Scaffold this active site. Structure first.
Site, PDB file in Angstrom:
ATOM      1  CD  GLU A   1      30.000  43.470 -73.082  1.00 51.36           C
ATOM      2  OE1 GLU A   1      29.071  42.696 -72.230  1.00 51.36           O
ATOM      3  OE2 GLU A   1      29.647  44.458 -73.518  1.00 51.36           O
TER       4      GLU A   1
ATOM      5  CG  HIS B   1      26.931  41.936 -69.749  1.00 47.36           C
ATOM      6  ND1 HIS B   1      26.719  42.541 -70.553  1.00 47.36           N
ATOM      7  CD2 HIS B   1      25.528  42.038 -68.596  1.00 47.36           C
ATOM      8  CE1 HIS B   1      25.463  43.212 -71.764  1.00 47.36           C
ATOM      9  NE2 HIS B   1      24.995  42.241 -70.506  1.00 47.36           N
TER      10      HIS B   1
ATOM     11  CB  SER C   1      22.038  43.576 -70.866  1.00 41.73           C
ATOM     12  OG  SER C   1      22.896  42.174 -70.790  1.00 41.73           O
TER      13      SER C   1
END
Ligand code: NAG
Ligand code: NAG
Length: 536
Positions: free
Chosen positions: A327, A440, A203
């Site tokens: 995601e 995610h 990330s």
């Protein structure tokens, strides 16, 4: 010393350390937790670039994780493992610049390749001490030297009045860079090879790794990079100097405050005052957008990451990059109406159009029309389940998948050796709903080998799968290639290329090679949207 354990005393540039023997499933590892690395960036030092840790006397105890950098603590779902696992697990403090080292026990005989982990959390949260970043499995099973550091997040790490002396910006990236230097200088004392340093991160961690690639002084500090679900390019990872100055002076106003006097006033605010207002400075209602991020300062970042990846030579560079199946789903519960973790989140077409203005906050009405038109399923335009998944796909594609696709493309086109994956396995132990798929952040516990921990209730195939991922990652650190030289045909994992655009799927089944990373849709986000936006 004398009655101490002899395999746990090590000396580094700043002084002597005492580590701790830790139990991993298959045997013990050495851990050195909470190694200083910098002068506490407190008081007059807030917003300032870090200075190297002044040497201490005596034996610094390095048996526990140190403070977590001052940050916003998430309370959307009190008590829920799915959110708590990312929450700070040590005292919040501004005195937080510490790093951790895991190594085999006894420490390696020959120089061993080093992995450096950089956590994510949107540049406003995160900690190297979280359970999912536990380096003891990689150290025990792969014999790796694993290092992870804290860096300043949020205002403390990223508030900038660009041009100024007292708040130049990007100091959180500077924190990371100083830990990189530290590893260069000192990792030899643990049996680490300063000449085989691999960055990996997820990330905002991946975007961080990416910025080190694009910043000259960092380039000499590492050799290979892994970017999981994040890129320096893209809509959220950087702000222009103008926009950073705008947010800094607005936040200064919200707390009660010529650059020098402005910053001098901010330096007198309790750290929690800064946190309590940091979310109030965003231009629009939004998700996947964070107030204080790396700024394009013409210094650490000489130009936009877009401009840098377009005109840079990456011959020297081997890179592993990837994304998870879903995601975008995670962010929908954090600000899109209709969405919750407690129901199936079936939404209406109206909530979809509203959700698109939020997930693409920078879009004109025509731009938002394009997105909604692209993502609508015209055989079933009103179907609540498709709309729910289109919303998730919009957010995922705009922020991660397409920025990642564009990153792999440019780097391959320009010399880099690039390996690409999509991670598709949903952990059996996941506490988020099924509609969120593989969210995610949920490959991390596999890369770090958590499933090898008996008491964790992973399945046996999950345990085998974790060993594969650990293998790919550590082989890549060792050689710049995920593939096992020994093990022949599994099959192989091919470089990503502009020509063939191959990537692999990571799940319980063996490596399967696919072609084109959302090619059609990424052409929308990467080629069309920008042009439409600049003509509206
Ligand atoms: C789920 O919960 C949210 C928030 O409580 C609500 O707005 C939404 O309408 C709910 N969705 C369904 C499918 O009932
Ligand atoms: C694993 O499963 C056992 C048996 O139900 C349970 O007692 C234990 O708390 C579980 N561990 C975790 C943290 O999931």
């Amino acid at each position: 010393e004398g009655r101490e354990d002899p395999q746990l005393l090590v000396r580094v540039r700043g002084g002597q350390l005492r580590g701790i023997r830790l139990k991993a499933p298959g045997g013990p590892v050495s851990a050195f937790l909470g190694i200083p690395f910098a002068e506490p960036p407190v008081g007059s030092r807030r917003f300032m670039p870090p200075e190297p840790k002044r040497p201490w006397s005596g034996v610094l105890d390095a048996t526990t994780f140190q403070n977590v950098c001052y940050q916003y603590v998430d309370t959307l779902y009190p008590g829920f493992e799915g959110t708590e696992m990312w929450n700070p697990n040590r005292e919040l403090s501004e005195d937080c610049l510490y790093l951790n080292v895991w190594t085999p026990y006894p420490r390696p005989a020959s120089p061993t390749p080093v992995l450096i982990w950089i956590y994510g959390g949107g540049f406003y949260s995160g900690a190297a001490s979280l359970d999912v970043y536990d380096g003891r499995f990689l150290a025990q099973v792969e014999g790796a030297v694993l290092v992870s550091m804290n860096y300043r997040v949020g205002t403390f790490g990223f508030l900038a009045l660009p041009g100024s002396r007292e708040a130049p910006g990007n100091v959180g990236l500077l924190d990371q860079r100083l830990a990189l230097q530290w590893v260069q200088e000192n990792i030899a004392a643990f049996g680490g090879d300063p000449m085989s340093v691999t960055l990996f991160g997820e990330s905002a961690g991946a975007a961080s790794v990416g910025m080190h690639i694009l910043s000259l002084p960092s380039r000499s500090l590492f050799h290979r990079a892994v970017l999981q679900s994040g890129t320096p390019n893209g809509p959220w990872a950087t702000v222009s100097a103008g926009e950073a100055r705008r947010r800094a002076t607005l936040l200064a106003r919200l707390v009660g405050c010529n650059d020098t006097e402005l910053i001098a006033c901010l330096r007198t605010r309790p750290a929690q005052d800064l946190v309590d207002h940091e979310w109030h400075v965003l231009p629009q209602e939004s998700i996947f957008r964070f107030s204080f991020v790396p700024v394009v300062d013409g210094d650490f970042l000489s130009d936009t990451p877009e401009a840098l990846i377009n005109t840079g030579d990456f011959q020297d560079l081997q890179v592993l990059v990837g994304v998870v199946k879903d995601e975008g789903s995670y962010f929908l519960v954090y600000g899109v109406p209709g969405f919750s973790k407690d129901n199936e989140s079936l939404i209406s077409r109206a909530q979809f159009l509203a959700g698109v203005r939020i997930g693409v906050p920078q879009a004109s009405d025509l731009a938002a029309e394009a997105v909604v038109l692209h993502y609508t399923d015209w055989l079933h335009p009103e179907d609540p389940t498709h709309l729910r998944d289109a919303m998730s796909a919009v957010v995922g594609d705009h922020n991660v998948v397409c920025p990642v696709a564009q990153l792999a493309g440019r780097l391959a086109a320009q010399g880099a050796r690039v390996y690409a994956y999509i991670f598709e396995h949903r952990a059996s132990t996941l506490t988020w709903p099924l509609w969120m798929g593989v969210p995610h952040g949920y490959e991390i516990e596999f890369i770090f080998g958590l499933p090898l921990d008996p008491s964790l209730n992973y399945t046996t195939e999950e345990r085998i799968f974790a060993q594969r991922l650990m293998k790919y990652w550590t082989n890549f650190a060792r050689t710049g290639d995920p593939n096992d030289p020994r093990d022949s045909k599994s099959p192989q994992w091919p470089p990503y290329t502009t020509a063939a655009q191959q990537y692999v799927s990571l799940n319980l089944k063996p490596l399967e090679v696919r072609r084109g990373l959302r090619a059609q849709t990424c052409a929308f986000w990467n080629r069309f949207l920008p042009k439409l936006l600049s003509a509206t």
